[PDB]
Amino acid sequence: PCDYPDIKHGGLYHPVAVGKYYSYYCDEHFETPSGSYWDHIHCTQDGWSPAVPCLRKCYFPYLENGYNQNHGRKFVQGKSIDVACHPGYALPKAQTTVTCMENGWSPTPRCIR
Amino acid sequence: GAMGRLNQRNINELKIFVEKAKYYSIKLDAIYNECTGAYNDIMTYSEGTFSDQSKVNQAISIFKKDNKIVNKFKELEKIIEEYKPMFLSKLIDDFAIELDQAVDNDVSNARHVADSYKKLRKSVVLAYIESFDVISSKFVDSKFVEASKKFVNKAKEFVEENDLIALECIVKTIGDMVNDREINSRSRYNNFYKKEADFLGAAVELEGAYKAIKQTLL
Ligand SMILES: [Zn+2]
Numbered sequence: 001p002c003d004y005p006d007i008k009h010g011g012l013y014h015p016v017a018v019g020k021y022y023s024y025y026c027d028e029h030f031e032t033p034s035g036s037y038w039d040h041i042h043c044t045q046d047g048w049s050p051a052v053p054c055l056r057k058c059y060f061p062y063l064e065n066g067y068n069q070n071h072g073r074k075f076v077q078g079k080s081i082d083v084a085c086h087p088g089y090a091l092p093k094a095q096t097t098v099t100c101m102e103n104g105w106s107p108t109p110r111c112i113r
Numbered sequence: 114g115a116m117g118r119l120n121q122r123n124i125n126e127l128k129i130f131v132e133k134a135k136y137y138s139i140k141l142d143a144i145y146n147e148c149t150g151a152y153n154d155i156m157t158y159s160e161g162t163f164s165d166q167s168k169v170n171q172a173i174s175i176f177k178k179d180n181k182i183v184n185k186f187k188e189l190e191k192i193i194e195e196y197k198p199m200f201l202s203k204l205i206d207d208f209a210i211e212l213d214q215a216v217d218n219d220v221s222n223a224r225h226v227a228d229s230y231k232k233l234r235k236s237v238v239l240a241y242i243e244s245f246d247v248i249s250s251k252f253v254d255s256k257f258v259e260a261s262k263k264f265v266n267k268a269k270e271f272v273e274e275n276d277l278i279a280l281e282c283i284v285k286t287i288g289d290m291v292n293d294r295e296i297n298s299r300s301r302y303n304n305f306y307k308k309e310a311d312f313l314g315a316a317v318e319l320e321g322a323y324k325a326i327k328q329t330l331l
Contacts, residue, residue: 029165061157064149065275072162087302088278110149113142113277 002043009102010054016043030054031076058100065089065111075100085111116253117330123252124291124326130248131291134192137241138281141234144185145277151175152227159224166218173215173223176230183209189237196244201236208233238276241283242268257322264315271308278306286316293327296320 002016010026021040026032032039033050042049055077062071067084075081080099083091089111091098098109151172158164176182183205190201208229216222242265249261271279282301289296298313300306 059157059163061153062160064152064156065277071157072160086275087305088275088281108150110153112146112149 002048005041005048005053007041007053009056012041013038018043018045024053026054030056035076056100056102056104058105060105061109063109063111065113066109077102083109089113119253120326120329123248123254123257124323126251127248128291130196130244131287133195134241134244134284135288137189137192138277138284140185140189141237141277141280144182145234148175148182148230152230155223155227159220159227164220166220169220169223170217173212173226176226177212177215180209183212186233186237190240193240193244196247197240200240200243201233204233204236235272235276238272238280239269241280242272245283245287254322254326257319257326260315260319260322264312264319267308267312267315271306271312274306274308278302279308279312282309282312286313290316290320290323 001018002020004016005012005022005024007024007026009030010024013023013025021042023038024041025038031037032053033055039050039053041053057077058075058079060070060073060075060081062068063083063085065086066089067086070081073081077100080097083096083098085091091109092107092112095107098105098107154165154168154172158169186201186205186208190205193200194202211226211229215226245268246261246265249257249265252258252261268279268283271282286296288294296313296316298310298317300309300313302309304310
């Protein structure tokens with residue numbers, strides 16, 4: 001009922017039936033819904049129970065000519081943050097909000113001229 | 114009367130300069146925008162917390178890609194080479210080598226590249242002010258040399274606060290002067306940059322001298 005699982009951005013420590021479970025890890029820049037490097041993937045009713053097993057983490061960069069209170073802070077997929085630049089510089093396309101996503105920040109945070 | 118003829122040569126050798134360097138801020142902004150990502154990543158991961166060598170390497174890839182950034186620096190020297198030979202030529206050549214010898218995964222190596230870029234950028238701005246300086250220096254109207262000295266001085270202080278904002282302001286302001294356009298003393302950045310107000314004041318004093326010379330030739 002739950003065929004082989006593939007941990008996008010991770011893998012298994014090492015056909016299946018409901019109730020069985022396998023331990024899995026996340027690659028360097030991802031963590032688990034619990035915030036850990038590892039956890040169980042559980043064969044359930046609606047497939048594997050951690051639907052999305054590994055979730056990306058984003059560190060907010062230092063921004064040349066930016067307000068940089070937030071530089072270094074860590075965010076997790078789905079988390080956003082208010083970006084602002086010094087007068088003369090600006091986030092592109094008049095945007096003000098950047099969002100941590102599977103492949104990283106979107107859009108990328110930078111103060112342009 | 115043979116003084117007028119010389120004041121005109123001055124005014125002319127200045128208008129030529131301003132026209133040739135007209136696009137200076139616009140090309141440095143271009144460079145800045147293409148590089149602000151890389152320099153950001155390098156500063157982020159040269160801070161002692163965590164490191165992404167892939168990122169710190171893509172940073173280096175953006176600088177060296179097609180020897181383009183270096184080339185865009187060479188274009189800006191070409192404009193000011195006439196006025197101030199081998200100001201920048203040394204520091205551009207130096208910067209190109211550092212990027213070649215840039216070693217993969219060495220973060221202290223990257224951060225040297227970032228600091229060198231950030232210096233080379235300021236140097237490019239200073240070379241505009243230096244080129245202005247050598248031209249206004251040769252003016253026989255003394256009141257203009259006095260104003261020009263003060264303008265150079267306040268210009269350089271504005272650069273040390275912020276090089277790209279100082280330059281766009283210096284280029285806009287002198288472009289206004291030689292085009293007989295009124296110079297506004299009111300800040301264009303809501304007084305965020307502390308050096309603007311006094312530079313604009315020097316720019317008004319220089320307008321006055323410039324406007325005094327032009328009336329000699331009527
Ligand atoms: Zn810091």
